Amino acid sequence: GEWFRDNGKHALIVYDDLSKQAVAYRQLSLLLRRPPGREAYPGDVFYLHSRLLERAAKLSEKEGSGSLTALPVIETQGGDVSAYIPTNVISITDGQIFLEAELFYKGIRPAINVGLSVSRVGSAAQVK
Amino acid sequence: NLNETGRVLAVGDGIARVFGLNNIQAEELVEFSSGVKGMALNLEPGQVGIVLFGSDRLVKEGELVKRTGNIVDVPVGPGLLGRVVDALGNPIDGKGPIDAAGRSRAQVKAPGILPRRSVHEPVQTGLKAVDALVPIGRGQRELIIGDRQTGKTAVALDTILNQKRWNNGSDESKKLYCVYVAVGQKRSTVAQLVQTLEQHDAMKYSIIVAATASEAAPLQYLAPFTAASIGEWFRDNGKHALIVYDDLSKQAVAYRQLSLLLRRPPGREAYPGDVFYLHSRLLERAAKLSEKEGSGSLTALPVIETQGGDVSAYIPTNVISITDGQIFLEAELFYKGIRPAINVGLSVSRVGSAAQVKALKQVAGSLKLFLAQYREVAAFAQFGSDLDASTKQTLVRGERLTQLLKQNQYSPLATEEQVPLIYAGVNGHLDGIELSRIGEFESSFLSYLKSNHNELLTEIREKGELSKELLASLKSATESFVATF
Amino acid sequence: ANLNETGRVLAVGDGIARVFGLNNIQAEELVEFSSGVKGMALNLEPGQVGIVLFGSDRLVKEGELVKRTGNIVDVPVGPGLLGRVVDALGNPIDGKGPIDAAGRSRAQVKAPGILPRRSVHEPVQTGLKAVDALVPIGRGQRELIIGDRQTGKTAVALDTILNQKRWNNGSDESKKLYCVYVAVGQKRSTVAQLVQTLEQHDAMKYSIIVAATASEAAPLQYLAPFTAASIGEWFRDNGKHALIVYDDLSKQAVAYRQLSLLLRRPPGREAYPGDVFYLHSRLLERAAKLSEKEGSGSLTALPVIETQGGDVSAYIPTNVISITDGQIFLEAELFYKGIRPAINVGLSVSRVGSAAQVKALKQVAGSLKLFLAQYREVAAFAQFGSDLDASTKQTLVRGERLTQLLKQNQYSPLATEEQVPLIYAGVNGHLDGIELSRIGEFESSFLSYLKSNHNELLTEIREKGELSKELLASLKSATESFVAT
Amino acid sequence: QGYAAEISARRNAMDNASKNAGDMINRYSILYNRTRQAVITNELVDIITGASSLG
Amino acid sequence: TPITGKVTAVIGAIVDVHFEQSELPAILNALEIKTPQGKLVLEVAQHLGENTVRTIAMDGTEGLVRGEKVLDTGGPISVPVGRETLGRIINVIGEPIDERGPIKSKLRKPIHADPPSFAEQSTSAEILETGIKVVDLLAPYARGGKIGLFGGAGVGKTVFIQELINNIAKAHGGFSVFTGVGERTREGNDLYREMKETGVINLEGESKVALVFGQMNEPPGARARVALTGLTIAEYFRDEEGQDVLLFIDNIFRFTQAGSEVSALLGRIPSAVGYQPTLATDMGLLQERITTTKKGSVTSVQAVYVPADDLTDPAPATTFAHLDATTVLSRGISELGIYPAVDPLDSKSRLLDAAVVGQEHYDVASKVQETLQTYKSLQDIIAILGMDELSEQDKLTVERARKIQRFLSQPFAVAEVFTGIPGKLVRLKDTVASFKAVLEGKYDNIPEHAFYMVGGIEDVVAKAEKLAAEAN
Amino acid sequence: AEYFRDEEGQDVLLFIDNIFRFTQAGSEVSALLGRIPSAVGYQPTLATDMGLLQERITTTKKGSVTSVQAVYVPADDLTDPAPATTFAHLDATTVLSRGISELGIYPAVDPLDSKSRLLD
Ligand SMILES: Nc1ncnc2c1ncn2[C@@H]1O[C@H](COP(=O)(O)OP(=O)(O)OP(=O)(O)O)[C@@H](O)[C@H]1O
Ligand SMILES: Nc1ncnc2c1ncn2[C@@H]1O[C@H](COP(=O)(O)OP(=O)(O)OP(=O)(O)O)[C@@H](O)[C@H]1O
Ligand SMILES: Nc1ncnc2c1ncn2[C@@H]1O[C@H](COP(=O)(O)OP(=O)(O)O)[C@@H](O)[C@H]1O
Ligand SMILES: [Mg+2]
Ligand SMILES: [Mg+2]
Ligand SMILES: [Mg+2]
């Protein structure tokens, strides 16, 4: 996708899902006998996602005005946003589209919890 | 030279790394120069890991070690009846040598898929709350899970006492021999338990296996397995057996100790990975055999000790998954006056009515379902709002049924005495009686039938079912008594 | 290259160092490296030795020279430390020139035996009314100061020091009580400003300061309490009385769990090692009252523990409570309602108070502690708004008056003679009639009434320290007469 | 008139209930922390104990 | 020729000894090392191999130098036994620490010994009146039985025992053995004063109790063996003398606590919570020795510590099974001001049976529990809504319940310096009738305060009348 | 910052955003090194590290350095080590509420939450 970004275009990449990625990486790390951290995740697990999401951005006019958007997907376990992995991701991204099964059952589809869902950029990137 | 012997390299904490023994088998018994025996669990090129059955202050570096050539087995047969043996099967009651008929290994393969029968034979526990709600069946394993000081052992103990009704008889296919397996308990308690059995002439058909806390960890670990082989014996010779483990929770702690000490990596909470396989290959050993095999059977009443009422624990969940249901016992219900404190909400039997007596099956059909409605109404009347005729009617009866289920320890009740009581309950003849009256009502009503309507009790007993005629007489016998006093 | 008193560094990291040599070194013996950093042989192995670093590992390079001291870690002890601020080693950090020590004592001393001791019986006026009434402290007692962040834990220890000035400036010795404050894991400014307040109140003359800032290596904070202890033990053996305050021990354990985890030690509850108990244990035991044969000297200790969210059920806290002779919990809630000091009578306790409390207070304050305990139970039970009877309401009115009377501003220590009168009125009920918002002004106005009038009573309670059957009457008629006006 | 007196009392009843129940939440919410931290530290201990396995 | 060796390693309370000779001392044996201060005693733990052994220090290991010479004793740590120990304070090692000369005893048995045979076990169902209401009414102790006093820090475990010694040790007639395991050194001294003043221990005369101490100030090795030392002395009077003995232990927890400190250095794989894998066994061998046999009877009052007020902790949780009577103290009850802070619900005994304490006693007790239980089950409702929402029947049970709870409290003569109220000794006979009278609803007029810290039921009505004059 | 304190002796302000990731950073580092994890997973050395930064920020006889560092509360819990340890050095707190800027109040400083240890 960066290709598109570098050449002066626009590319949207959706990681579905980062949760599974961490599990995979955890497996390699443990088998290789590297130090286990919270929930059996090595210390470099955060360095993993931070070094991934920061790759997407908005290049300046001089660079090519190209751009790469990222929509990473994280699966929580019973709304527990306090977990290790989620806390890492939520800390790096620039907003969340929190979804709740409950809101789904009522009929509200897509069940996007307006209360939690937020965007740090906001109107900056919304049609007037 | 070292093929049949070996020298000890290290020793401590009941573990002994002996060098040599390159022809010893897996899990084979051995003997040191000191006299103390041991068991080989870890086979390695350098050394062999062995666990001690006794103190280790006797084993020292460079000592000689010899092998037995045989897998750790225990004496079996009728002889043990009334005797109290240890893990290995040696007498500890002091009443002569154990006259056994055969010797079977500790670890035995579970019975085949082909040689099985669906459970249809009841197991009179004498407990109304039990035989009415969660019936036991010859060939199943009914768990007795609960916290400390609730009444787990009680349920089991009373059962054995109730068997006196048939073991003194002539018929074999009706009797039911009992095997109590004390594990982790102190010798003080075991002594008092065995005393109580004798006070009820229940020791004659009872075998006890002692694995007190003081003994070595490998004894507590092996105790249940050997004890099971003892009972399996009846199962194979076309007789019925009833083994009670008390408790597997301690056994896992013991088996956890050998693992950690043998330097075997722990799983969760230090328990060995295969901790599940510890209880799985134990409980599966009890089941109902095919008619070709002898129609023999072995029933199991595993006991577990939860902490703070947490059934979500590691060991308990492992066993709940294997057992054919569980008799949950809550401390909180005990104080409320529900004794035995059996929580119907959580206690179930997977065999169900198949195992229950046919007679008692009729008088209580949706009774368990009704007691469910009671707790539903009991919680909703907490609001402090008035109740209509319906919600109060069921509330009146549901409150008394719970009071009828309360039964004193050491007081097993026959089938002919349970049916009548439950009958007058499910119908609604107690509704018009005060709660503090249900108590003496039970005893009075029984004495009434044993004096007058005794013929009926004799029909229910033999037939075991209710005919169109028997209901008529039974109906009139109830109403007639209500009118009295 | 003498591998008997000197060795070479094999490796360094995590604050530990493995040196090769030192075959004639003692367990836990002080050492020094080429850089000049002091260490300690915490463990001895064949072929290598473990040394803890009291400084940054940056200064320790691999392959350097390592000389031994030949003596276990010790700190300068004597009267010359008074008014001087030192660190964990005993070196001056204030810059007023080297310390005049009379001798050197081991950093790790064993507590006095059971025979060379006596029960405490010497009151230790803290200046606080609510304290020296509910949970008084005596010479040789170990009173814990548990509470959450910013609750006034040191505010109770600090005022105690300033109140001792009343006897330190006297001629008699047995009346004077030396002070030794211990700061561990605290800030530079926090301690510096703390010292300044002592100089303003001219209390530094009789006080010794030992420093173990957070910036300093963990081990320093670990050895700071032990060494500082030996500084005050001196006064004890000489027949003098000393008072040491740890602020705070909870951080220490955290600093120690560091070296504990770095040296690879199986984690316990809350990641604290199993030997965390022996830490504070060995430290507090060294504070008691010696027999008359020893010198009749004592060492009162005031350990401080910081909890989270008012959780006294935590690990560290309970471990201390099972050692100290009473606690003075400081709930945050009461601290915000103005109730300061926020002493929670409910959890406050004194295992040897009445034994070391003035009889003048024992008489006027009877069952005051238990009353308050039951007070919160009925007070927090009537805060719903419901109407109560006269019995509960009557106790609710008197409780409130006492609660407000316990309140006291900081830096305002009151003589025992001044405290006795206030308690008397509270129990009797004379305050009950008094308005709630006038309780504060009343205290300051009541004291002036005695000084201006019944001064004789104040002078009697001062010397005698007990209320006779006659003075009891003269007092009653003097308060009752004031309540009316 | 006696209806206006019920609503008045019931308005006071549920006012203190929200205050007690509300304040009770600020108490259990603290127990949810220590219990959350306990599970995070305990699960971590087994992970370390399984890796610290040597000979 | 004395067997001699050299030190190879010294890590904390764990010292590794090596022997040049091909004869190695067995496990559980003692060792001695010459020092300027005195002599350091070691105890074999395990044979690491290569003629090297692992041992546990009995005192401070400061100053020990690698390769220092070590002398063998030839037998497990033994301690003097017999009437000669009475009125003397013995150390973990087995030497006088009261400065009154060496204990000239006839025989000296080892602290290590195997538990009584199953056939030797003797059961009894005799009640033991203590005078404590919350006990003699709910969970009565049995003669020559096992007593346990669980509870967090500062709940009342010792003060509870002290009273038991002030009421049973005096009118006992047999012998007593007090052993302070990992406890405040100060409490030992004050305990010595009490035994002298009361006359239980007369220096010039005779005594009725022996004092063995392994205080917390002492290192882990000692805190681990002290319990065994004290026990060896008491098992003597049990078999050899065959006389009733009262074995007072406080605190028994320190036994496992002290062993969990060294388990790490011993090279054992820590079990969950940090406790050593062999918790069940070690604790097992101890409790199994503390029991009544066909040769003599022994009543043991063991106090157990509850870490972080957690009863689910493996340490205390493995203690209940070794007790015929359990009296748990909840700090949630002591904070209410109620003392002793006994929890009627959790408290259990084996004597709580109508075939022993009588039918009426059984019924009265049960009624007290149910009433207290119903108060607890509505506690959630009380904090939220209040009693205004409680039904007529429920609201009456609460008050009554609250009356019963307060009534449970009892002034302790030993704790008079805390309550300021003279001790109150109540007989079992009067206690039963008392509560039974409260259940019948014959005192629903009397205010609750009149039940707080009250001794005899008569004192309730007396105290109720005194409160009438105080009302203004 | 210390340069302008000891050289030019100025009242320099050091801004750190956010003190939380500083503790997290340490936790990952100490994690890879092999050091055993403390309570909650944080590093044992946490206690000392915090001081090797906070202590260096003080007022000397030459100049002074005032630290204005943001704080993040992990899972809205103040019992946690990281926050617990940080607050132990904090002397004042300037909170910025949304409800404050919502009323048109700038800055969005909340008078009720903003407290100082020099308010005497
Ligand atoms: N049906 C009953 N009615 C009244 N009391 C009972 C009943 N069953 C047991 N108890 C009482 O409960 C107490 C403990 O009972 P029980 O021995 O069944 O518990 P447990 O599950 O065995 O606990 P543990 O495993 O610790 O022995 C006994 O003192 C006994 O008197
Ligand atoms: N009796 C009192 N009346 C009014 N204010 C008080 C009283 N006691 C303490 N304070 C105030 O509380 C503030 C907090 O300081 P203090 O040392 O008492 O808290 P702390 O809990 O001891 O903190 P730490 O434990 O970190 O030293 C003090 O600056 C002081 O002004
Ligand atoms: N029967 C009692 N009445 C009142 N207070 C008691 C009683 N028993 C213990 N306590 C309280 O316990 C404190 C002493 O604690 P202690 O009993 O030694 O606790 P531990 O069980 O930890 O030794 C005393 O201050 C006292 O108030
Ligand atoms: Mg049982
Ligand atoms: Mg403080
Ligand atoms: Mg105690």
State the Cα–Cα distance between residues B295 and B289, nearest whole angstrom.
5
The DSSP string of B344-362 is TTT-EESSGGGTS-HHHHH
Backbone torsion region of residue E54, taken as left when φ is above 0, otherwise alpha when ψ lies between -120 and 50, otherwise beta: beta
Distance B151 CA to ligand 1 centre (A): 4
User: Do the Cβ atoms of F80 and D41 come within 8 Å?
Assistant: no
The DSSP string of B359-409 is HHHHH-SSHHHHHHHHHHHHHHGGG-----HHHHHHHHHHHHHHHHS---T
- In E, which residues are within 8 Å of C278 by CB distance? 216, 219-220, 261
State the Cα–Cα distance between residues C274 and C252, nearest whole angstrom.
15
Tell me if B409 sits within 8 A of B155, measured CB to CB.
Answer: no
* Residues 1-40 of chain F whose Cβ lies under 8 A from any Cβ of chain A: 24, 27-34, 37
Strands C16-21 and C48-53: antiparallel
| Measured CA distances, E35 to B49, B277, E61, E228, E469 (Å) | 39, 54, 11, 26, 72
Tell me how crowded residue B376 is: count the other CB atoms within 10 A of its CB.
13
C221 is in an annotated binding site: no
State the Cα–Cα distance between residues E108 and C163, nearest whole angstrom.
55
State the Cα–Cα distance between residues B84 and B100, nearest whole angstrom.
13
Strands B64-71 and B5-12: antiparallel
Tell me if B83 sits within 8 A of B99, measured CB to CB.
Answer: no
Ligand 3 pocket residues where CB is under 6 Å: C 322, 349-351; E 151, 153-160, 339-340, 412, 415, 418-419
Class of domain E1-76: mainly beta
- In D, which residues are within 8 Å of A40 by CB distance? 47
Backbone φ, ψ for residue C145 (5° rounding): -120, 80
Q: Which ligand is nearest to the CA of E319?
A: 1
The helix (H) or strand (E) run that includes residue C306 is strand C304-306
Deposited resolution, Å: 3.4
State the Cα–Cα distance between residues C383 and C390, nearest whole angstrom.
16
Tell me if E251 sits within 8 A of E216, measured CB to CB.
Answer: no
Backbone torsion region of residue C441, taken as left when φ is above 0, otherwise alpha when ψ lies between -120 and 50, otherwise beta: alpha
Residue E49: Cβ-neighbour burial (10 angstroms; 0-12, 13-18, 19+): middle
User: Do the Cβ atoms of E61 and C27 come within 8 Å?
Assistant: yes
Report the alpha-carbon angle E331-E335-E336, nearest 5: 120
State the Cα–Cα distance between residues C308 and E8, nearest whole angstrom.
45
DSSP conformational letter for D21: H
Question: Among the CATH numbers 3.50.50.60, 3.40.50.800, 3.40.50.300, 3.40.50.720, which is that of C72-357?
Answer: 3.40.50.300
State the Cα–Cα distance between residues E245 and E176, nearest whole angstrom.
5
Tell me how crowded residue E367 is: count the other CB atoms within 10 A of its CB.
17
Q: Please, what is the angle between helix B468-483 and helix B438-451, to 10°?
A: 120
DSSP conformational letter for C438: G
State the Cα–Cα distance between residues E131 and A107, nearest whole angstrom.
68
The helix (H) or strand (E) run that includes residue E246 is strand E245-249
So which residues of B are the catalytic ones? 350
Q: What is the largest CA-CA distance in chain A?
A: 54
C154 is in an annotated binding site: yes
Tell me if B250 sits within 8 A of B215, measured CB to CB.
Answer: no
DSSP three-state, residue B95: coil
What residues does the ion ligand 5 have nearby, CB within 5 Å? C 153-154
State the Cα–Cα distance between residues B174 and B151, nearest whole angstrom.
27
Cβ within 8 Å of residue C292, ≥6 positions away? C118
DSSP three-state, residue B250: helix
What single letter denotes the amino acid at residue E403? K
CATH of domain B1-70: 2.40.30.20
As a whole number of Å, the CA-based R_g of chain F is: 17
Say which CATH superfamily domain C358-485 falls into. ATP synthase alpha/beta chain, C-terminal domain (1.20.150.20)
Written as six digits, the tokens of E408 are 């449970």
State the Cα–Cα distance between residues C300 and B343, nearest whole angstrom.
55
Distance from CA of C147 to the nearest CA of D (A): 16
Among E84, E82, E97, E92, smallest CA distance to E59 is for E92
State the Cα–Cα distance between residues C410 and E233, nearest whole angstrom.
55
User: Do the Cβ atoms of B266 and D55 come within 8 Å?
Assistant: no
Tell me if E145 sits within 8 A of E127, measured CB to CB.
Answer: no
DSSP conformational letter for E150: -
Among C330, C309, C339, smallest CA distance to C147 is for C330
Tell me if B422 sits within 8 A of B367, measured CB to CB.
Answer: yes
Written as six digits, the tokens of B48 are 């062999």
User: Do the Cβ atoms of D44 and A33 come within 8 Å?
Assistant: no
Tell me if B180 sits within 8 A of B209, measured CB to CB.
Answer: yes
Name which of C189, C215, C258 is nearest F51 (Cβ-Cβ): C215
Is residue E161 in contact with ligand 1, taking CB distance under 6 Å?
A: no
Q: Which of D34, D44, D49 to mutate to test the interface with F (most CBs of F within 10 A)?
A: D44
* CATH level 2 (architecture), domain E77-351: 3-Layer(aba) Sandwich (3.40)
Q: Which residues span the domain enclosing D41?
A: 14-55
Distance from CA of C325 to the nearest CA of D (A): 27
Within 13 Å of residue D4, how many CA atoms lie on the same side as its CB? Answer: 1
The DSSP string of C31-88 is EEETT--EEEEEEEETTEEEEEESS-GGG--TT-EEEEEEEE-EEEESGGGTT-EE-S
| Measured CA distances, B3 to B32, B40, B66, B68, E415 (Å) | 15, 15, 10, 13, 69
Cβ within 8 Å of residue A42, ≥6 positions away? A25, A26, A29, A34, A35, A36, F31, F32
What is the best residue among E418, E424, E452, E453 to mutate for testing ligand 3's pocket, by most ligand atoms within 8 Å of CB?
A: E418
Within 13 Å of residue A117, how many CA atoms lie on the same side as its CB? Answer: 10
| Signed CA dihedral, B409, B413, B418, B421: sign only | negative
* Residues 23-42 of chain D whose Cβ lies under 8 A from any Cβ of chain C: 30, 33-34, 41
The gap from C-alpha B381 to its chain's centroid, in whole angstroms, comes to: 37
- Measure CA of the first residue to CA of the last residue in chain F; give whole Å: 29
Cβ within 8 Å of residue B407, ≥6 positions away? B127, B128, B129, B339, B340, B413
State the Cα–Cα distance between residues C461 and C471, nearest whole angstrom.
9
Among B109, B72, B48, B37, smallest CA distance to B282 is for B109
B276-281: long-range contacts at Cβ-Cβ below 8 A with a sequence spacing of 24 or more?
B276/B318, B278/B248, B278/B251, B278/B252, B279/B248, B279/B252, B279/B318, B279/B319, B279/B322, B280/B322, B281/B107, B281/B110
Interface residue ranges in chain A relative to chain F, Cβ cutoff 8 Å: 34-35, 37-38, 42-44, 46-47, 82, 87
Considering chain E, tell me which residue range(s) the CATH 2.40.10.170 domain(s) occupy.
Answer: 1-76
Tell me if E176 sits within 8 A of E246, measured CB to CB.
Answer: yes
Within 13 Å of residue C160, how many CA atoms lie on the same side as its CB? Answer: 30
What is the best residue among B409, B410, B413 to mutate for testing ligand 1's pocket, by most ligand atoms within 8 Å of CB?
A: B409
The helix (H) or strand (E) run that includes residue E348 is strand E348-349
Distance from CA of D7 to the nearest CA of C (A): 16
CATH of domain B357-485: 1.20.150.20
Backbone φ, ψ for residue B412 (5° rounding): -65, 135
Is residue B154 in contact with ligand 1, taking CB distance under 6 Å?
A: yes
* CATH level 2 (architecture), domain E352-472: Orthogonal Bundle (1.10)
DSSP three-state, residue C258: helix
Written as six digits, the tokens of B428 are 């609604």
Backbone φ, ψ for residue E365 (5° rounding): -55, -50
Strands B325-326 and B348-349: antiparallel
Backbone φ, ψ for residue A62 (5° rounding): -70, -35
What is the best residue among C150, C186, C197, C405 to mutate for testing ligand 2's pocket, by most ligand atoms within 8 Å of CB?
A: C150
Binding partners of F (≥3 Cβ pairs within 8 A): A, C, D
CATH of domain C1-71: 2.40.30.20
DSSP conformational letter for B268: S
- CATH entry 3.40.50.300 includes domain B71-356: yes
Q: How was this structure determined?
A: X-ray
Distance E162 CA to ligand 1 centre (A): 30
C150 is in an annotated binding site: yes
| Measured CA distances, E280 to E24, E315, E320 (Å) | 29, 9, 12
Give residue numbers after which chain E breaks (C–N above 2.5 Å). none
* Residues 386-405 of chain E whose Cβ lies under 8 A from any Cβ of chain D: 386, 388
Among C321, C344, C349, C348, smallest CA distance to C333 is for C344
The secondary structure of chain E in percent helix, strand, coil, rounded to multiples of 5, reads 35, 20, 45
As a whole number of Å, the CA-based R_g of chain C is: 26
Q: Provide the CATH number for the domain around residue D46.
A: 1.10.287.80
- Return the ligand 1 atom nearest residue E353 CA: 31
What single letter denotes the amino acid at residue E237? F
Tell me if F43 sits within 8 A of F35, measured CB to CB.
Answer: yes
